[PDB]
Design a protein around this ligand. Sequence first.
Ligand SMILES: CS(=O)(=O)N1CCN(Cc2cc3nc(-c4cccc5[nH]ncc45)nc(N4CCOCC4)c3s2)CC1
Length: 822
Amino acid sequence: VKKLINSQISLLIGKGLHEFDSLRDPEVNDFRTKMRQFCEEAAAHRQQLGWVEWLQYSFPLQLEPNRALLVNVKFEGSEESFTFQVSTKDMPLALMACALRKKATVFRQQPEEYALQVNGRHEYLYGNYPLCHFQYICSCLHSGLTPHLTMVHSSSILAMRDEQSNLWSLEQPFSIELIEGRKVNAMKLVVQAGLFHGNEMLCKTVSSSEVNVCSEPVWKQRLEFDISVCDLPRMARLCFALYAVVDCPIAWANLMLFDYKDQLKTGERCLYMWPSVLLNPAGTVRGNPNTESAAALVIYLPEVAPVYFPALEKILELLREILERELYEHEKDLVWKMRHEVQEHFPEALARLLLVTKWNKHEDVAQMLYLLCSWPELPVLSALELLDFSFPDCYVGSFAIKSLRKLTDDELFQYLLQLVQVLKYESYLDCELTKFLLGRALANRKIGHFLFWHLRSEMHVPSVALRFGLIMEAYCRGSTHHMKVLMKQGEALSKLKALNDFVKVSSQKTTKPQTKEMMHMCMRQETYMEALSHLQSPLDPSTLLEEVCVEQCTFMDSKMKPLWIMYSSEEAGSAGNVGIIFKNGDDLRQDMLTLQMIQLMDVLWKQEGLDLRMTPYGCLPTGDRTGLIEVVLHSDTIANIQLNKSNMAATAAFNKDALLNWLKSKNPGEALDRAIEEFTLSCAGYCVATYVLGIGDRHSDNIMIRESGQLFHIDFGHFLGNFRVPFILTYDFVHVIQQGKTNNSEKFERFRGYCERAYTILRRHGLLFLHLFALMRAAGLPELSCSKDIQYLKDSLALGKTEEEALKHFRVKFNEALRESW
Ligand SMILES: CS(=O)(=O)N1CCN(Cc2cc3nc(-c4cccc5[nH]ncc45)nc(N4CCOCC4)c3s2)CC1
């Protein structure tokens, strides 16, 4: 059986476990056994949670960031059901109490023994929260639908938990022998080598001698560094670049100077190099796995004798405010001079102080560290900054995580993407971020779900295959049942891939009707109906994808022929009708990032009492240029609506009215007012978001409308101006906002106010967007590479200005946009 699990994990993670063994690597070995132990204890803890606590793990609450409503309630093993009138202000307990009085009178005769399940979803209502604080109840109130809930007893929840069981001494210069290589090229070869601590060089770079493109080249030369061996910090990174000149980059490679056991490295190393875009301090510190073809480098670390980085005990033993809100040398000097006063009176300036400490002088690093050890904990915002590559020191990183432990699960969820990308900065396999991520993942199944997919979706990338593989295995050890739930998900994704391939071939040889009919036959095969039905959605583990609705599945006409799959569910009713899009061949990472940022804006806006009626729909890369998009039902693109089709409700005399006619047919009489309002609020949100994010190429094919009137955006291929994208006012939206009128400054100016409020709120969290984008730089996304992309966000949010200047400036961009509206 232990054999069976092993094989199922290998299949799930997209890598055979035997492949970890073949490496015969102490570090991999150690990571695997340590992390397995840590995960198994978390799984032990879990099997003994109270039932409310188990619910908290398995289905965490979906909460928002007087009035009467109707709700329908039923008991688990029963057809019969009761509709109740309650207040939005009532706790779930009150509602559970009615349900039992209604049961007892029909049936002829304790609320605390139950929780409420959302019908046909893995979602639950419990806690001390007014009904309208639950996202589900909120949703229902807006759309107008009646909440439908099931009373699930405590014994039923426990049956679920039950079924889911499992040194200072060395003053001489640092130096290496560069021995030889075995590359490929056209001219002379050179090797540049520098020592780095993050971005900062620890001393000048040093160069090789020139030897012709010859072989299989040989050097046997000492390269000596203009720093002493006792001054190398714990996180010292030696970087190499090999190129050609009479400039032509060939390859690079980096390693840590201390291994994972803190021991300084000696003697000979073989370095399998990565092929180039000259020095790459931020690149991984593990060699290329394609050792068959990779250019190799042999160097020799000299035996300085066995030496270890001194323990913490030995470490411990050893106009200010005016600037303190890029600094000159003397400025740096004051800060260092006044570090105690910084620790005492300005703890939040830790980072600026860290950036001024001389990391190439051990006495100084000792002193900076001395302060770090008694530094008070910092807010989440500050901690996120410290995770940046600018702070490679492990005591800093450890302090950062320590300051992050106070993340709520909702917050952790919101930043999960960036924390994962930061893993690519790590120097070793066993690290605080990993154990942190895994422990929080083992305490929250939703966290666990998205961690798994963020990791799984990158297994085709050699620089991270090993690390990410190792983490997913360890997690699997911590949850056998969820492993099985995830495979079921991977099996469906495997079949969609095969079906998508057929559709690609087929569509090149036959008409769309014929391909769709054969797609349906293919889907109707037993293997497919089985693989495609009865899973949790990778887009949202609380969404259940029950019976695939074959007749309604089809595909889109764009290059990659993405599949459009519909599902239904008797037990969920209408909310069990959900749709996913499967795309293979395009990159979805940029869309996911953009959509997480828009969703963050929505959270910040709602935290200040501003709901702009956003449509934050799921988007999730799952594999190599593979992932899923959630279908927002009851929506259509502007373009489709603007086709101005005859024999249709929305039949216009002027194309400018098409959109308004459409909203009118979806929203008869009095409902129209609210639809126009919903359109107005969301339009503001999206105009601000796309402006702040530099999302261009917006047009009537990538903008959508919901039947409620909410406007949203799909298919982002560009952001951060990676085409300065101007603010955008489209006429036809302005026409809707104006309720059809040529002049309606009263409506138009409400709309301006919404844009300004939304904009000024985001400026106030400008710093949170900058730290998050900074961490995203580790993604390797082509439009998020360097400083100018970040600067795009400084400029868009005008963060160097007072609120009055930024607003005035914004007013010019906006007024400029209105002129541009015809
Ligand atoms: C004739 S046809 O069969 O070829 N086709 C043409 C017109 N289509 C309209 C659509 C295109 C469309 N593209 C996307 C997408 C495409 C590429 C990247 C993306 N990122 N995010 C979305 C998205 N996402 C969509 N969503 C996302 C969620 O909300 C409703 C449907 C829709 S709806 C429907 C039928």
